[PDB]
Curated annotation (Swiss-Prot), chain A:
Component of the 26S proteasome, a multiprotein complex involved in the ATP-dependent degradation of ubiquitinated proteins. This complex plays a key role in the maintenance of protein homeostasis by removing misfolded or damaged proteins, which could impair cellular functions, and by removing proteins whose functions are no longer required. Therefore, the proteasome participates in numerous cellular processes, including cell cycle progression, apoptosis, or DNA damage repair. Belongs to the proteasome subunit S1 family. Component of the 19S proteasome regulatory particle complex. The 26S proteasome consists of a 20S core particle (CP) and two 19S regulatory subunits (RP). The regulatory particle is made of a lid composed of 9 subunits, a base containing 6 ATPases and few additional components including PSMD1. Interacts with ADRM1. Interacts with ZFAND1. The modification N6-acetyllysine is found at K84. The gene is PSMD1. PC repeats lie at residues 15-49, 50-90, 93-125. This is 26S proteasome non-ATPase regulatory subunit 1.
Swiss-Prot record, chain B:
The gene is PSMD3. Residues 1-52 are annotated as: Disordered. Keywords: Isopeptide bond, Phosphoprotein, Proteasome, Ubl conjugation. This is 26S proteasome non-ATPase regulatory subunit 3. The modification Phosphoserine is found at S401, S413. It comes from Homo sapiens (Human). InterPro entries: 26S_Psome_reg_C, CSN3, PCI_dom, TPR-like_helical_dom_sf, WH_DNA-bd_sf. Belongs to the proteasome subunit S3 family. It holds the Pfam family Rpn3_C. There is a cross-link at K21 (Glycyl lysine isopeptide (Lys-Gly) (interchain with G-Cter in SUMO1)).
UniProtKB/Swiss-Prot annotation, chain C:
It comes from the Eukaryota. Component of the 19S proteasome regulatory particle complex. The 26S proteasome consists of a 20S core particle (CP) and two 19S regulatory subunits (RP). The regulatory particle is made of a lid composed of 9 subunits, a base containing 6 ATPases including PSMC5 and few additional components. Component of a complex with USP49 and RUVBL1. Interacts with PRPF19. Interacts with TRIM5. Interacts with NDC80. Interacts with PAAF1. Interacts, in vitro, with the thyroid hormone receptor (in a thyroid hormone T3-dependent manner) and with retinoid X receptor (RXR). Interacts with ERCC6. Belongs to the AAA ATPase family. The chain holds residues 11 to 51 of 406 of the full protein. Component of the 26S proteasome, a multiprotein complex involved in the ATP-dependent degradation of ubiquitinated proteins. This complex plays a key role in the maintenance of protein homeostasis by removing misfolded or damaged proteins, which could impair cellular functions, and by removing proteins whose functions are no longer required. Therefore, the proteasome participates in numerous cellular processes, including cell cycle progression, apoptosis, or DNA damage repair. This is 26S proteasome regulatory subunit 8. It is found in: Cytoplasm; Nucleus. The gene is PSMC5. It comes from Homo sapiens.
UniProtKB/Swiss-Prot annotation, chain D:
GO terms for biological process: double-strand break repair via homologous recombination; mRNA export from nucleus; proteasome assembly; proteasome-mediated ubiquitin-dependent protein catabolic process. Component of the 19S proteasome regulatory particle complex. The 26S proteasome consists of a 20S core particle (CP) and two 19S regulatory subunits (RP). The regulatory particle is made of a lid composed of 9 subunits including SEM1, a base containing 6 ATPases and few additional components. Belongs to the TREX-2 complex (transcription and export complex 2), composed of at least ENY2, GANP, PCID2, SEM1, and either centrin CETN2 or CETN3. Component of the homologous recombination repair (HR) complex composed of ERCC5/XPG, BRCA2, PALB2, DSS1 and RAD51. Interacts with the C-terminal of BRCA2. Keywords: Nucleus, Proteasome. It is found in: Nucleus. GO terms for cellular component: cytosol; integrator complex; nucleoplasm; proteasome complex; proteasome regulatory particle, lid subcomplex; protein-containing complex. InterPro entries: DSS1_SEM1 (IPR007834). It comes from Homo sapiens. It comes from the Eukaryota. Belongs to the DSS1/SEM1 family. The gene is SEM1. This is 26S proteasome complex subunit SEM1. The lineage of its organism: Eukaryota, Metazoa, Chordata, Craniata, Vertebrata. Expressed in limb bud, craniofacial primordia and skin. It holds the Pfam family DSS1_SEM1.
């Protein structure tokens, strides 16, 4: 998808940022981040928004010690929302992305693939309906099902 | 003695500079090229290796003798040693011998001393990674050593060098085999070495069993691993098989394949030369004329030296049998002219319509044709001389008498005057209609069909060739 | 092993021949992707 | 190159074809052209 992210129309560039967002969210792949760097620099408004949310899914539960671009992005999220000259559209996904990185108090993440080998359907369904949040704003709440707890439970038996 | 005594020191350090850093930068560069990239091949230092082998093959080769740098033969074949972190100290030892030769006199050990020397890569135990670097460090003294041609007791050391190379070849077949990449750098060397096989075997005995070994190698390349190797193996086959009867003619049809891609460049065209003579033995010129012409236009830029001239010697043969031949002094070369003088008088009398003029050249100049083995054309060319004479007389005379035409062409009798024309009509040589009463021969000029059929057939070659130029330009244009 | 260590030489040769063929097809894809970069320019 | 096989072993040319035709035929010619006059 590296070459589709360079397409002339920002609609295919938006879908192309989303592909890397949802597919690579369970991974710490740096190549995906590298291709999502120039996406927030496009003069088109909403494609920058797409880069915000995608880059928010690559950094779930991953701190600065994972990839060096974490703080780089976190200052950009607040920068775009505190500037009046920027589009309201682009600054929507900014605070939304801050919500992605901080989801569950940083304690939870999204996982489409359990370790058992089977896909988690509430996760997948939630995120796929969450693809278009413009058309229906309450559809942004279906992403809450995608959040899965990552914890070590040492319960021996019973209560 | 003082003058020559002071002129001895300067020469030896000139190689000991360049030849020391030559296969150290080329072999040592290809050492890191062989660990990775390794794409394709490339291994661009393999092409640089062609240039280096050809570099010493002019100056200074290996040796001689010379009683100075003859110690490089044991030097580079010693001290692998052994693993890469241990090779640093050995690379320094190579430089310690420079001070040894600068202080005291240089030690010369060759001939019988080479038997343990060539077995020292097996004594070091071992290189151990690069068989082609050991094959190059062992061959690089051996390959120009053939230039001694002493023929006494060191040729069996060349046989021992083929045996040691066969040990390195067992190591070539057993090791790797999955993304080998040592084979693709070694196929240039298996090429050159096998050509040196036949070179050495030409001075003693032709190789019947080494062709069994060669064909084992040949067929065993397909399909497992063949890159550039089998194209050379087929030419090894063809080279002595063209000189040695027989059947080798139709042998190529069952070998092909083609074999693609054509490599290395001109190396494929010369293959077209060998098969050009072969396909000439079947008397088909249309297939022979293109394979001959392609050989010359596909080979730049020379020098050297005389084989590029000989391929042209046989180039115009098939065109002379065709009946349509260009004047050959446009390709005239100062080194080539002196060689084809008798041959040039041959074609000179061939284009003429006089039959006696042609029969004189075979008598006087046949002694040269014995060496070229070119008598195969001299029997079949007569047909073309008589066809040329009759063609001339056909277009140049409206009505010709069959009895009076025999005196000019020394046809000698009335009866064959009918025979030449009979087969001339049978082959479409002349459209004339002949009446036998006296008899007489009349001819007529018909046209206007003409530019209907002939130019469109040429256009089919013209346009297809032009679009091929377009495709080959697009291919090299899209790389940036 | 003869099945095997040397029969997996042909087996894994399919890996190297597919990667060589695919290196030709990938050179044909690279030189063709320059087209798309240029036409998008 | 020099690799492989080779170490083993207007212009005036177009008209020089016709000149080759003049070399083996009718000399040049002056003398014969002047000798044919008194023969008959």
């Amino acid at each position: 998808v590296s070459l589709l992210s360079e397409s002339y129309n920002p609609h295919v560039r938006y879908g192309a940022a989303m592909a890397l967002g949802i597919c690579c969210a369970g991974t710490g792949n740096k190549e995906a981040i590298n291709l999502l760097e120039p996406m927030t620099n496009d003069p088109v408004n909403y494609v920058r928004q797409g880069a915000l949310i995608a880059s928010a899914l690559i950094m779930i539960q991953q701190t600065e010690i994972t990839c060096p671009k974490v703080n780089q992005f976190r200052q950009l999220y607040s920068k775009v929302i505190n500037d009046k000259h920027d589009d309201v559209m682009a600054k929507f996904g900014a605070i939304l992305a801050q919500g992605i990185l901080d989801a569950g108090g940083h304690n939870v993440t999204i996982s489409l693939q359990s370790r058992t080998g089977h896909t988690h359907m509430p996760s997948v369904v939630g995120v796929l309906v969450f693809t278009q949040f413009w058309f229906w704003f309450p559809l942004s709440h279906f992403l809450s099902l995608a959040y899965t707890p990552t914890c070590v439970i040492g319960l021996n038996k019973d209560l | 003695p003082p003058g020559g005594g002071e002129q001895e020191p300067p020469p030896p350090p000139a190689p000991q500079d360049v030849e020391m850093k030559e296969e150290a930068a080329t072999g040592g560069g290809s050492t890191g090229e062989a660990d990775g990239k390794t794409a394709a091949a490339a291994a661009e230092h393999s092409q640089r290796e062609l240039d280096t082998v050809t570099l010493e093959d002019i100056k200074e080769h290996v040796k001689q003798l010379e009683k100075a740098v003859s110690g490089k033969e044991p030097r580079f074949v010693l001290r692998a040693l052994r693993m890469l972190p241990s090779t640093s100290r050995r690379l320094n030892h190579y430089v310690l011998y420079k001070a040894v030769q600068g202080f005291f006199t240089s030690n010369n050990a060759t001939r019988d001393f080479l038997l343990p020397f060539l077995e020292e890569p097996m004594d070091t135990e071992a290189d151990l990674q690069f068989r082609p670097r050991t094959g190059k460090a062992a061959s690089t003294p051996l390959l120009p050593e053939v230039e001694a041609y002493l023929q006494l007791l060191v040729v069996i050391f060349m046989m021992n060098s083929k045996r040691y190379k066969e040990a390195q070849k067992i190591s070539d077949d057993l090791m790797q085999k999955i993304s080998t990449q040592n084979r693709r750098a070694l196929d240039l060397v298996a090429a050159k070495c096998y050509y040196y096989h036949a070179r050495v075997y030409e001075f003693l005995d032709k190789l019947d069993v080494v062709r069994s070994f060669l064909h084992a190698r040949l067929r065993t390349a397909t399909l497992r691993h063949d890159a550039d190797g089998q194209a050379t193996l087929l030419n090894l086959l063809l080279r002595n098989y063209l000189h040695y009867s027989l059947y080798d003619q139709a042998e190529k049809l069952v070998s092909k394949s083609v074999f693609p891609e054509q490599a290395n460049n001109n190396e494929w065209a010369r293959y077209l030369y060998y098969t050009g003579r072969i396909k000439a033995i079947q008397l088909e010129y249309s297939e022979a004329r293109r394979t001959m012409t392609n050989a010359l236009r596909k080979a730049p830029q020379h020098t050297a030296v005389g084989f590029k001239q000989t391929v042209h010697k046989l180039l115009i043969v098939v065109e002379l049998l065709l009946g349509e031949i260009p004047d050959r002094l446009q390709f005239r070369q100062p080194s080539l002219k002196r060689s084809l003088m008798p041959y040039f008088l041959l074609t000179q009398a061939v284009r003429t319509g006089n039959l006696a003029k042609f029969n004189q050249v075979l008598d006087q100049f046949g002694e040269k044709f014995q060496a070229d083995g070119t008598y195969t054309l001299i029997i079949r060319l007569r047909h073309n001389v008589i066809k040329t004479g009759v063609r001339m007389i056909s277009l140049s005379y409206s009505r010709i008498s069959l009895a009076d035409i025999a005196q000019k062409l020394q046809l000698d009798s009335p009866e064959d005057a009918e025979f030449i024309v009979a087969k001339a009509i049978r082959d479409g040589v002349i459209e004339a209609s002949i009446n036998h009463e006296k008899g007489y021969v009349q001819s007529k000029e018909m046209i206007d069909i003409y530019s209907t059929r002939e130019p469109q057939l040429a256009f089919h070659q013209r346009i297809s060739f032009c679009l091929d130029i377009h495709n080959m330009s697009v291919k090299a244009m899209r790389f940036p | 092993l003869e099945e095997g260590k040397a029969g997996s030489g042909l087996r894994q040769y399919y890996l190297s021949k597919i990667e060589e063929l695919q290196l030709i097809v990938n050179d044909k894809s690279q030189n063709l992707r320059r087209l798309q970069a240029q036409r998008n320019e | 190159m020099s690799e492989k096989k080779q170490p083993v072993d207007e212009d005036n040319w177009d008209d020089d074809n016709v000149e080759d035709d003049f070399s083996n035929q009718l000399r040049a010619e002056l003398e014969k052209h002047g000798y044919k006059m008194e023969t008959s």
